[PDB]
Write an enzyme that holds these catalytic residues in place. Sequence first.
Site, PDB file in Angstrom:
ATOM      1  N   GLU A   1      -7.738  11.556  -3.284  1.00  0.00           N
ATOM      2  CA  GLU A   1      -7.889  12.166  -1.990  1.00  0.00           C
ATOM      3  C   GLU A   1      -7.256  13.624  -2.073  1.00  0.00           C
ATOM      4  O   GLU A   1      -6.200  13.565  -2.827  1.00  0.00           O
ATOM      5  CB  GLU A   1      -6.998  11.467  -1.284  1.00  0.00           C
ATOM      6  CG  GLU A   1      -6.893  12.083   0.371  1.00  0.00           C
ATOM      7  CD  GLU A   1      -6.368  11.251   1.269  1.00  0.00           C
ATOM      8  OE1 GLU A   1      -5.288  11.875   1.851  1.00  0.00           O
ATOM      9  OE2 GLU A   1      -6.347  10.129   1.572  1.00  0.00           O
TER      10      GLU A   1
ATOM     11  N   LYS B   1      -1.727   7.923  -4.653  1.00  0.00           N
ATOM     12  CA  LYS B   1      -0.972   8.598  -3.643  1.00  0.00           C
ATOM     13  C   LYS B   1       0.423   8.590  -4.305  1.00  0.00           C
ATOM     14  O   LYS B   1       0.936   7.576  -4.792  1.00  0.00           O
ATOM     15  CB  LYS B   1      -1.005   7.879  -2.446  1.00  0.00           C
ATOM     16  CG  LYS B   1      -0.343   8.722  -1.382  1.00  0.00           C
ATOM     17  CD  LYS B   1      -0.369   7.950   0.201  1.00  0.00           C
ATOM     18  CE  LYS B   1       0.137   8.956   1.264  1.00  0.00           C
ATOM     19  NZ  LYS B   1       0.430   8.415   2.370  1.00  0.00           N
TER      20      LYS B   1
HETATM   21  O1  LIG Z   1      -7.955   1.645   1.661  1.00  0.00           O
HETATM   22  C1  LIG Z   1      -8.074   2.957   1.220  1.00  0.00           C
HETATM   23  C2  LIG Z   1      -7.413   3.809   2.436  1.00  0.00           C
HETATM   24  O2  LIG Z   1      -6.311   3.105   3.035  1.00  0.00           O
HETATM   25  C3  LIG Z   1      -5.477   3.661   4.036  1.00  0.00           C
HETATM   26  O3  LIG Z   1      -5.891   3.950   5.208  1.00  0.00           O
HETATM   27  C4  LIG Z   1      -4.699   5.097   3.189  1.00  0.00           C
HETATM   28  O4  LIG Z   1      -4.040   5.391   4.261  1.00  0.00           O
HETATM   29  C5  LIG Z   1      -6.060   5.819   2.865  1.00  0.00           C
HETATM   30  O5  LIG Z   1      -5.588   7.109   2.232  1.00  0.00           O
HETATM   31  C6  LIG Z   1      -6.879   5.096   1.980  1.00  0.00           C
HETATM   32  O6  LIG Z   1      -7.935   6.238   1.571  1.00  0.00           O
HETATM   33 MN   LIG Z   2      -7.619   8.224   1.461  1.00  0.00          MN
HETATM   34 MN   LIG Z   3      -3.919  10.867   2.945  1.00  0.00          MN
END
Ligand SMILES: OC[C@H]1O[C@H](O)[C@H](O)[C@@H](O)[C@@H]1O
Ligand SMILES: [Mn+2]
Ligand SMILES: [Mn+2]
Lengths: 384, 384, 384, 384
Positions: free
Chosen positions: D215, D181
Amino acid sequence: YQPTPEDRFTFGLWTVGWQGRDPFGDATRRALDPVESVRRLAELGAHGVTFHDDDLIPFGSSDSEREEHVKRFRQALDDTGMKVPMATTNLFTHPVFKDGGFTANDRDVRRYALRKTIRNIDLAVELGAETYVAWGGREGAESGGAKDVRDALDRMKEAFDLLGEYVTSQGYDIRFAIEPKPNEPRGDILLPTVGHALAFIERLERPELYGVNPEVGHEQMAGLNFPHGIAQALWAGKLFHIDLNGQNGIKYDQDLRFGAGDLRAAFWLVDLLESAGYSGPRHFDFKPPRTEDFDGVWASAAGCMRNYLILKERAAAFRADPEVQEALRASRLDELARPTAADGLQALLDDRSAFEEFDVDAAAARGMAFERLDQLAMDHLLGA
Amino acid sequence: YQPTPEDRFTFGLWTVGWQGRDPFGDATRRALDPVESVRRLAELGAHGVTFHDDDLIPFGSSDSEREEHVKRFRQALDDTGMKVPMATTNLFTHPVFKDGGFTANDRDVRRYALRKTIRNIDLAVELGAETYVAWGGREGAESGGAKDVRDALDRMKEAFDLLGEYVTSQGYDIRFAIEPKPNEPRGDILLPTVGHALAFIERLERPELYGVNPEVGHEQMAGLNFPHGIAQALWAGKLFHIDLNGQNGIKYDQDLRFGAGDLRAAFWLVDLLESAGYSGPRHFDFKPPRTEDFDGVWASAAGCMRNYLILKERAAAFRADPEVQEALRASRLDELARPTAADGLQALLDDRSAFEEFDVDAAAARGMAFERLDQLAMDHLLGA
Amino acid sequence: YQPTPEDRFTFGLWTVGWQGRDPFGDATRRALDPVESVRRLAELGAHGVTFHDDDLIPFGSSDSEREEHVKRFRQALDDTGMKVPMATTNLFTHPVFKDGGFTANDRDVRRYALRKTIRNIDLAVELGAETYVAWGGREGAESGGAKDVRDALDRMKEAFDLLGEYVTSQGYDIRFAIEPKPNEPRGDILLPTVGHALAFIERLERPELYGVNPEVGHEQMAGLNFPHGIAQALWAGKLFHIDLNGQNGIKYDQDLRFGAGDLRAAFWLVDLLESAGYSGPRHFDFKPPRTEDFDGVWASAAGCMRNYLILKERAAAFRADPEVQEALRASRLDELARPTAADGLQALLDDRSAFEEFDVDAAAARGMAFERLDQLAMDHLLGA
Amino acid sequence: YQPTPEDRFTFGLWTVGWQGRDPFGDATRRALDPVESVRRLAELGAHGVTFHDDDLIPFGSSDSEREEHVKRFRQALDDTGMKVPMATTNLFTHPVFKDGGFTANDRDVRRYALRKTIRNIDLAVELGAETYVAWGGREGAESGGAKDVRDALDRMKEAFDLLGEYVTSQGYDIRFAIEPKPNEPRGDILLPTVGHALAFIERLERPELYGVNPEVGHEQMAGLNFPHGIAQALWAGKLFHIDLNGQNGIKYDQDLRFGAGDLRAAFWLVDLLESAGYSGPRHFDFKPPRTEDFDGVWASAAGCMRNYLILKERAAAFRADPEVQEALRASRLDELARPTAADGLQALLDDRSAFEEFDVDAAAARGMAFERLDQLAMDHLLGA
Ligand SMILES: OC[C@H]1O[C@H](O)[C@H](O)[C@@H](O)[C@@H]1O
Ligand SMILES: [Mn+2]
Ligand SMILES: [Mn+2]
Ligand SMILES: OC[C@H]1O[C@H](O)[C@H](O)[C@@H](O)[C@@H]1O
Ligand SMILES: OC[C@H]1O[C@H](O)[C@H](O)[C@@H](O)[C@@H]1O
Ligand SMILES: OC[C@H]1O[C@H](O)[C@H](O)[C@@H](O)[C@@H]1O
Ligand SMILES: [Mn+2]
Ligand SMILES: [Mn+2]
Ligand SMILES: [Mn+2]
Ligand SMILES: [Mn+2]
Ligand SMILES: [Mn+2]
Ligand SMILES: [Mn+2]
């Protein structure tokens, strides 16, 4: 670069008081008593503080609790000499505002939003506020069918017109400032930029009562040039308040301390505020990052004011430098300030130097000398 | 999904005629004769064409050459039944405009820009144009010292006021549409969004003569919601023209064919144009990608119109579906269209259901049902 | 802040030689002879120059013309002491490259691209270049069906593997640097960031022959942090070249002079290059804005080097300040550089201080002191 | 378009269970029991669920409470036939992680992060998970001095290498997927894109144990093309998991339901997953907007799966259409899949058709026919 209360530096209670909860994180700091924030800000050289209703009086308070909270805050102001130049309503935290306040699809919520605002206007006036900010952070949508924007703007105009009738009915001197933001927490927010807010104000019943409260980071979340938007607001006579902070580009609202983020934009902003003689508070809407403890909160607040004062000094040095003044003439900033055709339309139409005998190649060959001017500006910013 | 001239689809000569030169690339197609473009567009079912001065008459043409170029174009229009609803001035290609036309720092260039515009207004009226677009693509800056924005806006207002005095002096029925763009080719462009252009128009001497010409891709280059901005323009009564195309986010101006880029935004746009009864031309400002030969140019132009007609059908089906109409009521779009307080300010102040006895928890618990509504919209868009 | 050739400042011929043609504009400057550029750059204190094939030898030149162009350039290098540390191929301007060079869908174009590259590698080696840059600006797509990305990456790997076999077959010491860019002129470009280029290199047959050539503005066109990406490249041992310039956010590729755009990012970049002992050329890939005449071109080039030297001084002062060194310890930068578990996995698993008896609240309460550290950095940058 | 468990649709407990707290808003929904979520998802046709440690077992639970929470969840899985294909650790919510888990400047926090992960790996294996995701949402910085990125990457590598030694020591079959991210909640996040994560994995001690979990929205928050990044991951053999959702451009992480946001990108994504034979779970990481009640939560989850199945049908129809297959040949997608030079380097060097006798003008004149191909794709997507 030591501030004093006569630089008119102000802070929202919600700034230094931010506990550090974010979309993915619990609080990292304890809640602050507003009295402590007034005291600590005063000691740093701030001139005043601003508040949402719900920052000063916990939501759902009894009348006795309301009076007690206001009494204690008033004592802190008296103890420090701090002012309250601006207040605002929280129309975004409570779940009832999940689809908006003024533009909620539910009519009952719209009415409630207005009543909650009007209650706080009365309090703002009691505390001496000259400006009342409206930030419609819940006004907008995530999906196209959810909000008919023309009907929402009708509702928004109705709300603002009712608040202007209210302040007129009471004889209050307070004015409104609409704070734009393009997105977050809604997928798109109505009146997303300084421009859209200026345009909307011209359709209100008493436009003179409304201006804008532009925030550095909010215009930068649309990739816009903040100094340019402030110049258009000043041009329109509508810069009634400003929120100063930093932002690193097109992303979530960071609310960094002022000077962080786009430093050159901060320089040009201060240059413009000071050259235009902006007379409102230099208000900081920033969040001390959640990495910080309380010591770091106050360091961050102090850095807001320090950076403004360093930029002020550098910008003033730029404009006063005879070499810069020469460079400005070389780049024809003096000609930009002259009327194009004070001779009038017919004179322009009959002027053969404007068309038939205009040497376009000669005019095209003349360099604008903007890079030399901008390197002077860089050298002044850096003290080189 | 076959267009006919009564869908009012129009194209700029510069669209299909783009030779494919980009910042990093030479032309990939030969120049088109405007006559050929009129013919080929007519055959695809277009209703009309638009032009810059310099697309129809090569820059620097003699009076005899000017007359010949216009005669041939007029014959093509007569041969096809094509209209010319809009024209515009090229104030960006020639090096003399490197710092702007109307807001050039050099006063002589500003005067020249006005004279070049006024010459083309006369031609536009001769050809039957109802709208004259201004796109100030060179108005702006790369650096902060180069352009004092308040003085530039004074110049911009002076220019537009002179053009409004000109059209009034001649008795012409033509109106102006200002086309915003946030950046490119300047680092920041003045009047960067629909909002800023709307606000600026309200400061002109004859505001009724000016509206906006919003472009899908331009508002998306600031990450803004194009349907929302079009709704604000319609709300203001200022949607005098529109440029239809596609754009994939915050990047250089792509000018994809309409329907490409943000397809859902295209759907909501068509829904809004059609529901509001927008009566202007459906004008495409797109570039057939430079990968394409001429066959691909005409395929791309045809796809513009096809995609509009598919979206029109799907949006109409959405709004006419009784299940959608139920969902709209479930999400309280009907209540959004009701006045908040037609009972008036004092009645709202005295209404205990609006505050003292408002059950905020009950109102907060009511879901907005927007996801079901949006999945209906998706299912209609996809024909599922 | 006067550069000398021992700062290793280099410039592309295409930088100072940019004539000012943009998507919407004709040239504002005449073409420069490469000999003049070498001379003028030398006089400003540059150490060397870089070139595309087609900047030094006009495309389509005869063998006699090729020899003459190279002879004159070699004389200018001899006259000035300038070096040529890097060269590159133009695989983007000519219309044949409209769908790519190495990843063109047409196989014949891919083969041609390789042959044009190999010819210029030989020339680069003749002129003393140590690094050969590949910028795949045409590799990518505007639409999803046009390019199967897995097949394109197969082609890209095949191309780079063939060029590595070529340099190995000839015994050349030259290495390759792949320059990422996320978009422009293609809607999306393959290998759009430093990360994607690093990952791709690990799948080549002789990875040791390939690194990256990251450009400040290109990573900022994806909203990424350029210093962070340079740190990952350095971590991987892959920083073989760098392009220095400025960029104001997420928009078209501006190529501002270095120091313009994100000034704080420029500061952190220089801090990192200097602290890491980066030993490659400090290469500027910038465009003097088209507003400028030739005087302004050389002023802009000089400003590139000046800004690097001012930032170098400020960053060095930051790191050498005992107060900063204390602040760094207060923020636990020293602990970040210690191994997490040099004791090994089993020792960590058995360490009750790491879990069962870890006081998470006490560790959470400790502020990171990052704001004080960052205000020290600001004060050093500004010389306050 | 009715899903069944054999479409392998999965959901995180945190998706449907999101209470609606955002940066500016309190919860709008009550917390869900994981058992209820398993039941409701099963009824919608989901195949499985995923969890963070702290979604299944409240942080700080006793061993008896831990056992009870897992027993109830196991019963729900048994009752429904739901699987748990993936788990993950919460290294972001608790204030102790305010500067990171694995790359926290405090060494004690890094050790704690590893121990918390290893505890949950054991649980994931007990529940049958094949994939363990790591999302380093707190790894990064708001300021340049706070994090030396090379030392942070050393720490990150050490952490991942220790977790790979742990799973090898236990004989577990589970693999890791790193989720990139670019920003939010940190100003910049380390390993900000698919590319950077792929590159980092190649420096781990046992690279075969690690892939990516890209994602949709996260790559779109950098303005990147998600299908392209998925193609590079597939090319590398590293697509070990995927998060499906929607996002409207460069802004905060929206986590819209899949199909919302960039619909055309969703189409090209499904086309690629299905054509490549991706065999992992179709996992949704989405947030039902906070406007919604529980009915709307389940409607949003159902819409995720519906939109995937509609896109699957349309993409398959596109690829199977003989007219599309013809258009693909016309655009030379078949030639893109052929080796450039299977004849070898020397043969290419000696091939005069590749250079000396290559007709570049003829090859440049050939249109790519991409617009016709893309309009076929549009017509298939819309069912026109
Ligand atoms: O642990 C992985 C997940 O953690 C959290 O909720 C993040 O916001 C999400 O994007 C991710 O996929
Ligand atoms: Mn995610
Ligand atoms: Mn997201
Ligand atoms: O009420 C006005 C203030 O409200 C909120 O705290 C917003 O996040 C802030 O930008 C705004 O300035
Ligand atoms: O003149 C108005 C037109 O001019 C140019 O071609 C612009 O690039 C285009 O966006 C605009 O619509
Ligand atoms: O060849 C490498 C160079 O080619 C071009 O001029 C690109 O625009 C520039 O970014 C790149 O550095
Ligand atoms: Mn903000
Ligand atoms: Mn604010
Ligand atoms: Mn455009
Ligand atoms: Mn346009
Ligand atoms: Mn560049
Ligand atoms: Mn470059």
